[PDB]
Structures are given as C-alpha cells and as structure tokens.
Amino acid sequence: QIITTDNTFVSGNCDVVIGIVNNTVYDPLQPELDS
Amino acid sequence: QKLIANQFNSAIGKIQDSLSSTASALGKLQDVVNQNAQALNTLVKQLSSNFGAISSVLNDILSRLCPPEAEVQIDRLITGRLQSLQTYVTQQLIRAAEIRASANLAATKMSECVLGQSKRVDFCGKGYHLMSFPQSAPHGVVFLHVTYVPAQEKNFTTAPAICHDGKAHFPREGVFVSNGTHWFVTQRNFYEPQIITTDNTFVSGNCDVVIGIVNNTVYDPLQPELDS
Amino acid sequence: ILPVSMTKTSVDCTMYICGDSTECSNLLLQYGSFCTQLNRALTGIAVEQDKNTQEVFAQVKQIYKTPPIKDFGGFNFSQILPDPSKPSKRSFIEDLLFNKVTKFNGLTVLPPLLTDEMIAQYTSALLAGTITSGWTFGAGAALQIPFAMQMAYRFNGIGVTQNVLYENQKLIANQFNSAIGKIQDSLSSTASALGKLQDVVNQNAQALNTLVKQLSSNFGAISSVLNDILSRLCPPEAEVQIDRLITGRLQSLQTYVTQQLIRAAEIRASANLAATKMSECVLGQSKRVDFCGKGYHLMSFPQSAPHGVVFLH
Amino acid sequence: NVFQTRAGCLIGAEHVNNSYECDIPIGAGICASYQTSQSIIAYTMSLGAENSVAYSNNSIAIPTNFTISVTTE
C-alpha cells in the first residue's frame, strides 16, 4: 500500500532511530482539501 | 457496569449456595482423600493375613515356637508383608504422578487464569475468560473462573464486503449486518450497530472479485464538513 | 493422531491363579486382600478409560447437525462429514481410520461406555458446530456465520487481513479441498500413519497374551498344571507346590496390573492432550505455535479412530 | 425383566425406548437409572439435545446481550 498518514503513526524525529530512511508520506486530506 | 457488577455479585452468591447445598461438588478432592485412606486401610488389613504362616500375629510365632521352626514361619510373614508394602509404595508412586500432573495443571491455571487472562478456549472455564480467583481447599485449589457468555442471539443478514463507488469496503473490526433494510457494521461478540463509514472500514480492490458483496453507501465524515 | 483410551480389562484373579481348584482357592485366601486390590486397580483403570473418552468427545452440549444445503463458499467437507451410505454414519475419512487400525483364564475385555457410533455422533456434532458457527458453539450458543466469513475471521486471527481471503476465496477453497483429498490418499496407501493407535492395540494384546503364557510356567513346582499336583501329591506336600504356583501367578498379576496402571497414566496424559486439542484447536483458534499442526493455525476437524482421535489441522 | 445388552444379559432392569443422560453406566451405549411404582430402567444413553444451526450463505447470529458466568474448577 502507499505509505500514508492513515497507515502510519509518528513518534519523535529523524535523529533517534537507527536505520530510518527519507521518503514522502502521503496525507489523504491535503489533495482532498486543496481540490 | 451496574448490570455487569450485579451479574458478578449474583454469580458469586450462586457459588456459596452450590457449595452449601452440594457436599458432593468437591468430589475430586474427596476422592483423593478416599483413595489414600483406602490404600492405608488395605496396607493395615494385610497385617491380619497369614501368608501361609501358622498365625498372622508375629508374637504367636515368637511365643509358641523356637528359632529352627520360627524362622520358617516368620519368613512367610516377611515375604507377604514386604510384598504388601511394595504393592502399596508402587501404587502411591503412580498416584503421586497423577497428583503431580494435576498440580502442574493447577500451577498453570494459577499463572494463566489468575495472574493473566487466557485466550485458550475452555482452559479457564466455559465462555470467553475474563479473570479467575484462587480459593484454597483441603489438599487442592479451587478456581472461580469468571467468563463472559454471549447470551441473547438475534439473526441478521450479513455480507463479507460492501460495494460503494466501485471500491470494495471490508470492516476494520466487526461484521456488516442488516436489520432488513439498512446496513450497519458491528463488533463480533456484542450487537452494537454503527453507520458504515470510511473510518470503520478499509478498501481493497473493486466489486468484481468478492463472492456475495452487497451494494450500500459508505458515509465519509470529511465530506459534509469539507463541502459544507 | 492421538490415543484416548485403551482396551478396558477385568481379570478374575481367582480363576487366573487357581480356576475350579477349591484347594488352591483356600490357600489363596491366606494371601489376604491382594485379589480385591488387583480388581480395584483394573476397575479404576477401566472407569478412567470411559472418562478419558468423555473428556475428549463430549465437549459439545448439543448434537449439532449440518444443513440440508451445503453452501459453505466452495469448501467441500463431504469426506469428513457423516456418510448416510453406511450402516453406522462415520465419515469417509473415519472409515479409512477404522480400516487402518486392527481367554478362559478369567481374563476378559469390558466394552467402552460410548459405542463407535456415539463417538461418531460426537465428532459429527463437533464438526457440524465448527462448520456452521465457528468457535461460538464452544463459548455459548452456536451462532450461525457464513463459512467464507468464518474463514475471514480465521485469517484475521493469524494476522492476515480478511480481504486476502475474500479476494482469493476460490483458490483457498480449492487448496483446502485438494488437501483433504491428499488425506484420503495418505490413509488409503500408508497404514504406518496410524502406528500410534495400533501400538496401543498391540501393547494391550501383548500384555494379555504374556499374562496367559505365564500360566504355563512352573515357578519351581513339580508342574504348572494344578491338577497334576492335586492328583499326584497329598495336602502336607501339595500345599508347598501350590504355594509356588500361587506366588508366581500372583506376582504375574501384580506385574500386569502395575504395567497397566503405568500404561493407563500414559494414555490419560494423551487423553488430556487430546481433550486440550479438542478445546483449543477445534472449539477455538490456537495461537500456540505448533500446537495445532505446523503452520499458522486456521481450524481443526476431529475424526474418530479405534481407541483415539485424529485431528485434521 | 430381561434384556440382552452388548455388555451381557441384564436382568431385573426394565428396557425403555426413551433416552436420558447416563445415570449408571452399563457399556456399549446402555445406561440404567432408578425411576417411577419405581423400577430400575435401562436405556440407550442420550448424547445431548439434537440441534440444527440456522446456517445459510448470508445469515449471521450476534448476541444482543451477555451474562457474566462464575464457574468453579
């Protein structure tokens, strides 16, 4: 599935986690609200 | 919470009434007492046996006879009384293995039913396990297993998935049900119907594949907030 | 495959040791309550074999029966459900299991309390509940649920999202139907599969045959034929010879009853395991790794066999 | 007054066509019980109340209410 704000949760920031990777997370509200 | 508390308090009352009325209810413990008592009474009664000696009573042999014959009489009592003991001790070793197998089960019910909540079906009493309470008993343990029993069934028409705008929607947790005209999603173990929505369902693929998929609208809580 | 019960025996230790000789019976009375405690031990074993069977199969409060229309979403239980063609309504697979598994001296076999037909009515009820109502018939009232939706609950129970079932339902049904077909081939071709039940038959037959052959032994008497001693000799010497036969035949019984008490504890351990697999594998969906077969467990079907239960996990 | 069971010949027990829970076991599916005028009756044991679940490809039953059960082991 596409990585989204609906199938993921946040905790903390990029500094702590060993082996974290940069990728865009899609927020389904953003294009729906911008339309 | 008031209903559940009253059902629990009522069910604890039924335990007192059951035990007070029904002395046979502890039959598992009373049989273990009776078997160990019957084994000792059998071991003691075997001292009254002759085993082929002139008497069952050793002081008859020692008062009436002298060693050249008395040792022939005593060796029959030794042979029979030693066989009587080896039989008792063998059956106590086997009965001790039966009680150890029961104590290992009771220690496992302590850990899994009392110190925990058990997903294991019928391990902690019939119904879905909530919790258990240990009470001591003579040479044993009693567990009062509190369980949820689902208790007033109603029939509903049901569907594996819901068709909306070509997408097939499946419930996140629960099942789709209908009262006859309207479709709801409910949790599985208690009827609490809710409107079918983009929040309590997930999409996977489209209306072609699923056997027995049904058409119903899926409400989107963002839509009336966003457009109005 | 699990053992559940073993051949119930009753041994008339007076007819085994003596048999019609009232001279020997009056000597056997001098050994006291050995003969009643041998019968007590064999009766405790025998009554336990009916309990072992009751604990495994009688886990269902009502005799459920399947609907006249078999609309189970493509899953084909016909090989494991009762067969109306048979005089006793075992399933097709239960008949394979019943085909794969195969005196005067006071030794006797008592019948089981439940006939093989009553065991088959319990495996029918457990199976008909499991197919028509999921785990719910174990918890309370049987609640109907469509079998494809029950298998979608079984999929959520293994952490596989239920759309993975409904989007593959024909494939999953064909794999299940094919896997039940492979059970029939295995049970038709390979008798060594049932070896765990056949060994319980063989051990109890061998124990009785050994107990019979031990009547032929002299134990140091002039003969093992008790009527030789009583025809050739006179009571002051005949009782010395008969006490050797009584001692050896009584020791032969105590050896048999001891090994049957140990073997009964092995069968009871297996019956308590089978009763736990009935509750957790059939009436539920066990999370316990490799408890209900190798894989992420979905459901299990009980089938009866001689002296045992067979779970199709 | 006489009944051939598969366990053996049973004498003094009244054979009955009705079926009940097993009171005293006899073997091969037979049990006996003292019942009403009183006699020892002997019968083929009942395994439980017979039930057909209301199954179909689109019907589900859901509990609308529950009971908390406390059971003694």
What would your notes on this structure say?
- The structure is cut from a larger assembly and holds four copies of chain A.
- The first copy, chain A, is mainly α.
- The first copy, chain A, is built from one helix and no strands.
- At the B-C interface, helix 4, strand 3 and strand 9 of B face helix 3, helix 6, helix 7 and helix 12 of C.
- Strand 2 of chain B pairs antiparallel with strand 9 (66-72) of chain D, so a sheet runs across the interface.
- The PDB classes it as viral protein.
- Keywords: Spike, Fusion Protein, viral protein.
- The entry is titled "Down-state locked rS2d SARS-CoV-2 spike ectodomain in the RBD-down conformation, State 1".
Descriptive tags:
4 chains, part of a larger assembly, mainly alpha, 1 helix, Spike glycoprotein (chain D), 35 residues
Short précis:
The first copy, chain A, has 35 residues and is an all-alpha fold. Chain A has 1 helix and no strands. Chain A has one helix at residues 29-34.
Shape of chain A: elongated
Helix content of chain A: 10-25%
Biggest beta sheet attributes of chain A: none
State the total count of DSSP E strands of chain A. Answer: 0
Specify which chain pair forms the largest interface: B-C, 45 and 48 residues
Q: What is the tally of helical segments of chain A?
A: 1
Over all CA atoms, what is the radius of gyration of chain A? 12 Å
| Structural class by helix and strand composition of chain A | mainly alpha
Looking at how many chains there are and whether they match, the oligomeric state comes to: part of a larger assembly
Q: How far is it from the N-terminal to the C-terminal residue of chain A, by CA?
A: 23 Å
The ordered H/E elements of chain A are: H
Strand content bin of chain A? under 5%
Disulfide bonds (chain B): 113-124, 163-207
Coiled coil (chain B): 30-74
Protein name (chain B): Spike protein S2'
Region (Heptad repeat 1) (chain B): 1-51
